[PDB]
Amino acid sequence: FPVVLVINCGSSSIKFSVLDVATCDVLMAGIADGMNTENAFLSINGDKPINLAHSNYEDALKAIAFELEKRDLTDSVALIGHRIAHGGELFTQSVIITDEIIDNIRRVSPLAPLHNYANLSGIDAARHLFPAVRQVAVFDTSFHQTLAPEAYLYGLPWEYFSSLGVRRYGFHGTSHRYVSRRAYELLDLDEKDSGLIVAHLGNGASICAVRNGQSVDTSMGMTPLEGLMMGTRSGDVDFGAMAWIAKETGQTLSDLERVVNKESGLLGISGLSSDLRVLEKAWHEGHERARLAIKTFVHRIARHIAGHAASLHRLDGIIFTGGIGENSVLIRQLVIEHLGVLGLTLDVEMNKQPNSHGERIISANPSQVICAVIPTNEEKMIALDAIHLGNVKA
Amino acid sequence: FPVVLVINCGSSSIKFSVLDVATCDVLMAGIADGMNTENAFLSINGDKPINLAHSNYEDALKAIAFELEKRDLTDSVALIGHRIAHGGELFTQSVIITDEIIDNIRRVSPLAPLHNYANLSGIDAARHLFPAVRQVAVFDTSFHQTLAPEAYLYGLPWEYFSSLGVRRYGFHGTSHRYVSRRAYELLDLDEKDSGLIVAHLGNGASICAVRNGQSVDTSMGMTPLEGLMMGTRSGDVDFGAMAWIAKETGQTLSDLERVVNKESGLLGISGLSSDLRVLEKAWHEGHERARLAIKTFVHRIARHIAGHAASLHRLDGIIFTGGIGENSVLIRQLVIEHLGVLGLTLDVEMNKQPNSHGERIISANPSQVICAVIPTNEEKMIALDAIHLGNVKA
Numbered sequence: 206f207p208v209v210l211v212i213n214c215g216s217s218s219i220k221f222s223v224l225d226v227a228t229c230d231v232l233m234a235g236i237a238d239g240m241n242t243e244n245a246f247l248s249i250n251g252d253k254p255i256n257l258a259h260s261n262y263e264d265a266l267k268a269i270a271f272e273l274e275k276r277d278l279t280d281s282v283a284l285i286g287h288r289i290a291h292g293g294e295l296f297t298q299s300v301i302i303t304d305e306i307i308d309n310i311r312r313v314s315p316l317a318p319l320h321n322y323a324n325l326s327g328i329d330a331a332r333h334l335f336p337a338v339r340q341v342a343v344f345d346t347s348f349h350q351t352l353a354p355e356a357y358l359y360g361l362p363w364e365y366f367s368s369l370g371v372r373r374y375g376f377h378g379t380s381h382r383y384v385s386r387r388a389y390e391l392l393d394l395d396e397k398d399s400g401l402i403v404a405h406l407g408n409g410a411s412i413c414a415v416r417n418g419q420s421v422d423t424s425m426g427m428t429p430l431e432g433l434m435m436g437t438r439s440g441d442v443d444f445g446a447m448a449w450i451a452k453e454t455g456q457t458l459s460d461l462e463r464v465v466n467k468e469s470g471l472l473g474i475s476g477l478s479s480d481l482r483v484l485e486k487a488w489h490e491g492h493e494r495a496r497l498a499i500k501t502f503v504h505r506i507a508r509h510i511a512g513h514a515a516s517l518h519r520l521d522g523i524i525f526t527g528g529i530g531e532n533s534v535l536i537r538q539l540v541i542e543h544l545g546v547l548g549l550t551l552d553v554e555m556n557k558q559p560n561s562h563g564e565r566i567i568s569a570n571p572s573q574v575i576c577a578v579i580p581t582n583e584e585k586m587i588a589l590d591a592i593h594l595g596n597v598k599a
Numbered sequence: 600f601p602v603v604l605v606i607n608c609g610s611s612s613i614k615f616s617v618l619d620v621a622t623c624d625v626l627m628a629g630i631a632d633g634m635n636t637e638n639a640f641l642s643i644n645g646d647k648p649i650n651l652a653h654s655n656y657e658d659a660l661k662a663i664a665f666e667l668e669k670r671d672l673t674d675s676v677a678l679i680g681h682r683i684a685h686g687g688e689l690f691t692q693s694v695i696i697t698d699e700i701i702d703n704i705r706r707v708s709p710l711a712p713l714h715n716y717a718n719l720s721g722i723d724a725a726r727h728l729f730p731a732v733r734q735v736a737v738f739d740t741s742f743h744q745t746l747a748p749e750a751y752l753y754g755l756p757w758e759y760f761s762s763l764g765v766r767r768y769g770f771h772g773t774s775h776r777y778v779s780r781r782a783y784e785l786l787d788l789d790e791k792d793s794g795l796i797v798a799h800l801g802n803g804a805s806i807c808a809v810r811n812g813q814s815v816d817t818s819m820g821m822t823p824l825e826g827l828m829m830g831t832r833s834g835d836v837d838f839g840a841m842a843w844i845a846k847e848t849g850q851t852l853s854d855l856e857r858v859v860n861k862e863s864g865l866l867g868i869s870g871l872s873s874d875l876r877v878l879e880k881a882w883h884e885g886h887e888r889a890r891l892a893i894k895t896f897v898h899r900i901a902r903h904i905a906g907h908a909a910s911l912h913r914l915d916g917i918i919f920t921g922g923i924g925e926n927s928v929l930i931r932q933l934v935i936e937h938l939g940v941l942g943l944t945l946d947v948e949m950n951k952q953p954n955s956h957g958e959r960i961i962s963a964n965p966s967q968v969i970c971a972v973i974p975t976n977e978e979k980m981i982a983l984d985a986i987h988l989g990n991v992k993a
């Protein structure tokens with residue numbers, strides 16, 4: 206029984222999973238949080254928070270390697286999947302890692318200096334410690350490359366696109382890809398003749414229009430800061446307003462880059478929490494700023510779901526996924542109520558069911574469009590790309 | 600036969616019309632272009648481009664006053680309507696100008712320093728030269744004040760809204776108001792039970808969702824720079840991308856404020872023209888960058904039309920208006936083709952007809968939603984507010 210090791214190297218941490226090739230089931234999971242800071246640590250299955258103590262990316266993956274051996278599965282690791290933040294224009298699908306790929310990832314790395322350089326550090330690490338194991342790079346952008354120029358071009362001068370590569374890329378691609386596939390089976394739809402909208406709702410939120418199995422439009426942009434309002438992210442913001450704030454408050458563009466990214470969104474409006482469970486409780490106890498933040502969140506989601514429906518010849522499904530998408534009875538229903546124009550009717554018995562019910566339809570019978578919850582599994586999708594590329598002669 | 604003088608004071612010019620109260624018909628029109636620069640001039644009906652020569656706002660309106668007397672209609676001016684750019688939060692409808700109103704306009708003037716200070720200069724001028732004539736202020740934002748918080752709140756921290764007034768305002772309000780009214784008669788719809796989308800397409804472009812006679816959503820934001828891609832305006836732009844451009848190109852926020860406003864949009868992508876007639880010709884002669892700019896323009900309009908449909912309980916009409924909306928057979932049809940998802944069918948015989956056919960339906964019979972062209976008349980709407988307020992005891 207061979208296994209796939211899945212690595213996601215964030216700026217602050219290293220997430221990992223060990224999935225069994227046979228069944229695509231998680232055997233082990235963990236995180237190396239607070240990376241290379243004065244205090245560094247890893248917690249496998251949240252069962253024993255061990256201490257790294259000021260160790261870097263290389264030593265952190267070396268600690269995960271020790272525990273892979275402590276559980277006698279090191280010699281079972283047939284594949285390693287790397288989650289990559291930004292593939293730029295060069296990467297349209299998942300690849301087997303070579304020296305060339307690294308060069309190409311290094312090339313597009315200015316587009317996301319934070320996450321991408323950490324992704325490479327992980328590639329460098331896993332290579333060093335697992336050299337005779339095939340390694341795969343899976344990109345968070347690659348799915349969205351089917352977008353036509355009219356969908357990815359900004360209104361800016363042409364030079365910014367041709368000389369600097371300023372355009373829409375999109376994110377959550379792996380999630381959007383994974384969910385859309387499952388939707389074809391759940392909704393019983395012919396991929397090649399289908400129109401779906403997928404709402405990835407988590408601390409990061411994005412919408413994707415999938416026409417005939419292809420990503421035709423997506424909510425996020427060049428950076429994850431465009432589109433929906435999120436946990437701490439503002440979403441769509443008037444650039445004139447931002448320029449007006451800069452000249453008024455005296456804050457630099459760097460200052461606002463922190464505000465938009467880390468202080469805005471749900472956290473911004475409520476002034477209470479990035480977390481939705483808190484805000485749902487707050488509103489229940491008569492807190493208006495939380496109610497506002499939620500109603501706004503809902504409104505901006507409804508706008509982009511309906512917006513993205515334009516890039517379809519026909520609408521068949523709206524699919525909810527992500528932390529919020531899967532677990533919030535409230536947000537889902539408020540969003541569907543907001544989309545009555547599209548002829549949606551909801552089944553509140555079905556919409557009441559918790560996530561444990563997995564892939565489920567939540568729309569009543571007379572509805573023009575099928576609504577559904579499909580739990581996202583990025584780890585399974587990464588493993589599947591790896592397994593496929595595992596049979597390839599390189 | 601009394602008349603209404605209509606004044607629109609831009610940063611660079613002063614537009615004016617003389618409409619007859621009896622029939623609401625234009626008797627005289629003109630412009631005082633290149634204002635207070637080394638060379639200043641006015642052209643009435645484009646019939647004799649006279650020379651002001653370095654004269655300011657006060658002297659320019661004094662020149663228009665001379666020509667009003669030269670045509671023996673000065674003693675007929677019963678009302679004066681002022682087009683005001685930004686009403687802020689204080690102005691929900693059109694008002695009779697008093698000292699209080701001026702104070703209040705001065706208060707919200709930081710929200711639009713360029714246009715608003717020029718608007719006041721015009722108010723100061725018309726007051727001086729026409730003191731015993733009632734004067735009305737009509738706001739380009741007032742219509743959009745029916746927007747709910749979830750529609751006008753940005754994802755930014757709450758303070759920017761409460762202490763600085765950062766929120767969506769919207770523009771083309773007078774146009775959106777005027778067109779929507781006419782739509783009720785043309786489409787034979789009960790205002791109090793209706794859902795319309797209005798696409799104002801000109802050198803400035805904006806979309807408005809009108810639910811039961813009320814503006815519920817609009818494309819533009821705090822400033823006219825948000826929303827659709829326009830002539831020289833970028834439209835919706837990833838703030839992360841703009842921050843990335845700033846740190847990469849070395850340009851300041853002031854530099855980008857010029858680029859977004861005056862160098863981007865249709866002019867930006869094509870690198871040819873702000874004007875659409877040129878780009879339509881260019882594409883015909885096999886120019887891809889013009890074809891791209893148009894296809895993009897179309898895509899971003901379709902997105903926001905469908906987007907804004909979310910704020911409706913039911914969709915009854917899509918209404919095209921503005922320079923482009925009224926005169927471009929191409930753009931209209933490309934937009935409707937892009938909205939097939941909403942069950943629109945077009946009548947290409949009807950869509951072929953030039954603007955001379957005025958208020959017209961352009962959708963075929965089996966269509967789920969009625970499409971129509973309604974020529975906008977801001978001047979008529981301003982006069983109507985003035986005439987109404989003309990019967991009021993103040």
Ligand SMILES: Nc1ncnc2c1ncn2[C@@H]1O[C@H](COP(=O)(O)OP(=O)(O)OP(=O)(O)O)[C@@H](O)[C@H]1O
Pocket residue numbers: 406407408409410436479480481482483527528529532533534
């Ligand atoms: N039962 C629940 N009800 C409502 N909200 C929930 C529930 N469970 C989780 N959430 C919300 O889901 C969010 C976390 O989801 P998730 O783990 O997908 O975020 P993330 O992984 O950081 O973002 P991304 O998926 O974009 O990487 C939190 O904001 C939390 O409030």
Ligand SMILES: Nc1ncnc2c1ncn2[C@@H]1O[C@H](COP(=O)(O)OP(=O)(O)OP(=O)(O)O)[C@@H](O)[C@H]1O
Pocket residue numbers: 800801802803804830873874875876877921922923926927928
């Ligand atoms: N026959 C036509 N075919 C195609 N496009 C046209 C035609 N006539 C005018 N236009 C376009 O209409 C635009 C000008 O419209 P308009 O006068 O409404 O702009 P504006 O008044 O500056 O903007 P706003 O109405 O927002 O104040 C130009 O971009 C022009 O290319």
